[PDB]
Nucleic acid binder design. Structure first.
Lengths: 142, 182, 82, 59
RNA sequence: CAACAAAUGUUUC
RNA sequence: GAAGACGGUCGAACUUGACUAUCUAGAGGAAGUAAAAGUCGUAACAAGGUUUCCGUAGGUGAACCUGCGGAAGGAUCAUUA
RNA sequence: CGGGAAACCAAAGUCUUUGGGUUCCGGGGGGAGUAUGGUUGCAAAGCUGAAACUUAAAGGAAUUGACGGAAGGGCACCACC
RNA sequence: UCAGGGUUCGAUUCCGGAGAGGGAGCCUGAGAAACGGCUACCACAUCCAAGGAAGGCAGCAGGCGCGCAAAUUACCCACUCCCGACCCGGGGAGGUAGUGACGAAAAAUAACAAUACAGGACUCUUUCGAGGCCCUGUAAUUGGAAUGAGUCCACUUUAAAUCCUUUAACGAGGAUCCAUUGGAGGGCAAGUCUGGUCGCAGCAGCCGCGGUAAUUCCAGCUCCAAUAGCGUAUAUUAAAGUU
């Protein structure tokens, strides 16, 4: 029970807990403010940038495909980031020097699937929603 | 500007057994949606929790006495609850139908003046039903005991009297302009 | 509908050094259906896939033969010097 | 390690012969639709003890 | 009675 | 009874060094990482054909080799005189 | 008896029926006992000890084959003699 | 956020504290180290006939920049209160409308017979067969039976209006007065589909699918789930007895 049991010993128990909390990764991340300091997105949920170039990335085994992302300079902190472009032929819709709204995978910062070193996805261009673009609700305005 | 939610969804989402149960409730009870059921599963859980707390308290305990009796009296005014129940030991052993049974909709069936939990809801939502001086359009209502008798069609909706119907009255003048003259 | 290629060096593990007849050396990846019974060589003709991607690289899809090579003059692909 | 192509981008979407929309019915407003569900599912819905059956079956 | 060598390498499966 | 004015106190600000904290450019260099279908050796899961591994020191294309003291998580829970 | 995932364990028992005292270390695996500052050292090195990134299994135990240049093994001129 | 224990947040309708471009000083007055006072410097910006001169929206609107992200350059002191010499004036305090799917409440987009039929427990019959209650669909159209959503005399609201809550005259036969958004291989609710492709495009948080009979794709058809809402990303919490 690895832990005193004296009526007094609040301070030891209280503090021993403070000492071990660190190992928790979610906890440490939060106390070290990692999201502000390391992360490309601010510690925000979405982030907008300009498209530098279009990449065809080489999906990891045992899968085999060309992935199709763009490389993006985030306006907020000039950070360089590669982001996936989802659905069929949607690259089509984003051009070099584009602008785009990027969002996390939903993986907690950890890349997704077979898609290697890509941690973000495009959501908007034409300020304009790949979904609405892919469907043809709305266009590549211009 | 204070506000609160009135319903709670179930922890979990796909438990055939629960889904069927809810569907039977919607059907018997001319309900509209799962929320319609969820709202009541929620109403009930709070009542039961209110009950359970009380039941853990000492009897005669000014707090237990004063609020227990009140919860009971409230639960009885609406007919939801009955006397032997009408103590806390019995609310603990209670269920959703008991509430669901007191809404308008099912009463307008329950005395002929609808012949369907169906008919009932469209009747209510369409202004042909007063609870004695007052139209009530809320198929969702909760008919209090000594209020059971005052439910009836309204003073003007046609049944309830009053000309015919913006569509019946159309039909009267539908046999009038052509078949009468030119 | 693209050109071809010509293996120059070998790397290993889904990696091979090739020399596109056009004068472009890149690391091509074997093809999945071809690799089944095809083992690219450092001296042979091959076909790699390459689309909107600068073309700086390509993946191997199928292979070729040699004996036919003499016919390649007839293939209308290689010049009077290959 | 990327090199490769995109030539083929969007090859199936563009090769997938479009289909009409056809049409037909409206399905029903809120509670009424719940009612049809409950009768089709449960009243309907009698079931057999056929060792079961299905919702989106063909033959 | 005691003791004794040995390399590498093509596919979905 | 004003401007002004003697000397002082508070002291913004300015100029030059020191100090401390936080952040950030950089020719090049050397790690580790991915990793992975490559090249050269065979270093150490079956006693892996030199049992393995630890501490430590020197040395080697590269796995690794070797001495000195440990361990068995070994290939012995035994040795019958 | 009872414990434990089992191998096992009279302590590794008296642990969901979870509470005798006290002390220490761990929170998936790799990056790494690595970077960096402090400290100790003549030196070799020791103590304290991250991150970026990387990745969906790392690992334990038992069960069973397959297989062995492990032991008792056999059997056949598709094996030897 | 709910076992209980707990776990996390709190700028933000109240209280206490702090500031009004940055710093410092001061006058007045009972009360100020005040900036819708002043004064200097410091940083900024403006007018000028170039000597001068005047300024501070972390007030209300609005505008730039910033970004993932946030409304009218609108009406009124009538309510609620405040101030003054004040019953009487004045109040971007504050009310009032406009924008407003933060989010929360109520819950429309169709109910009832009839034929017509399709059917099942019940009864009768040796069986065939027939009757029968409870009814649900499903057409066939009927048939009578309906209500605001819009629209609109009148009236209400209120400072005056708006909307609500109020109503004469209109407003439901479906092709509508036309409901959506995700899913249907496992977890996971729902295609041992049809066309197309053939480890390609794509799908896939995870496991995994697709290499020519694809229940995972791409589309339809059909079906499920939540439903005037639903998907997605993210902080954080529950789950987590993985602090």
């Amino acid at each position: 029970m690895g832990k005193c049991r004296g009526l007094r010993t609040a301070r030891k128990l209280r503090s021993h807990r403070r000492d071990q909390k660190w190992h928790d990764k979610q906890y440490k991340k939060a106390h070290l403010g990692t999201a502000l300091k390391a992360n490309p997105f601010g510690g925000a949920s979405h982030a907008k940038g300009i498209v530098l170039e279009k990449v065809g990335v080489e999906a990891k085994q045992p899968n085999s495909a060309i992935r199709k992302c763009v490389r993006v300079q985030l306006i907020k902190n000039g950070k360089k980031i590669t982001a996936f472009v989802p659905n069929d032929g949607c690259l089509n819709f984003i051009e070099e020097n584009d602008e785009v709204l990027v969002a996390g995978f939903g993986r907690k910062g950890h890349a997704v699937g077979d898609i290697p070193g890509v941690r973000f996805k495009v959501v908007k261009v034409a300020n304009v929603s790949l979904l609405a673009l892919y469907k043809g609700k709305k266009e590549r305005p211009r | 500007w204070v506000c609160r939610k009135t319903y709670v969804t179930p922890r979990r989402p796909f438990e055939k057994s629960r889904l069927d149960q809810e569907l039977k409730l919607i059907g018997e009870y001319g309900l509209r949606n799962k929320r319609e059921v969820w709202r009541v599963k929620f109403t009930l859980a709070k009542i039961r929790k209110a009950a359970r707390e009380l039941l853990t308290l000492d009897e005669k305990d000014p707090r237990r006495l004063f609020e227990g009796n009140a919860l009971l009296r409230r639960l009885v005014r609406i007919g939801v609850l009955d006397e032997g129940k009408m103590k806390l030991d019995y609310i603990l052993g209670l269920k959703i139908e008991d509430f669901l049974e007191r809404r308008l909709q099912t009463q307008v069936f329950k005395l002929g003046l609808a012949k369907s939990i169906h008919h009932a809801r469209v009747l209510i939502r369409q202004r042909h039903i007063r609870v004695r001086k007052q139209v009530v359009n809320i198929p969702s209502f909760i008919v209090r005991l000594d209020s059971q008798k005052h439910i009836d069609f309204s003073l003007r909706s046609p049944y309830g009297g009053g000309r015919p119907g913006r569509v019946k009255r159309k039909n009267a003048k539908k046999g009038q302009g052509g078949a009468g003259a030119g | 509908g693209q050109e071809y290629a010509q293996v120059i060096k070998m790397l290993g593990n889904g990696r091979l050094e090739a020399m596109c007849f056009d004068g472009v050396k890149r690391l091509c990846h074997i093809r999945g259906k071809l690799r089944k019974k095809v083992w690219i060589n450092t001296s042979d003709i091959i076909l790699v896939g390459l689309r909107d991607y600068q073309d700086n690289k390509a993946d191997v899809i199928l292979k070729y033969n040699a004996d036919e090579a003499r016919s390649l003059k007839a293939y209308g692909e290689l010049p009077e010097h290959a | 390690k990327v090199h490769g192509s995109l030539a083929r981008v969007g090859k199936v979407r563009g090769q997938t012969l479009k289909v009409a929309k056809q049409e037909k019915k409206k399905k029903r407003t809120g509670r009424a639709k719940r009612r049809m569900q409950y009768n089709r599912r449960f009243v309907n819905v009698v079931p057999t003890f056929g060792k079961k059956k299905g919702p989106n079956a063909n033959s």
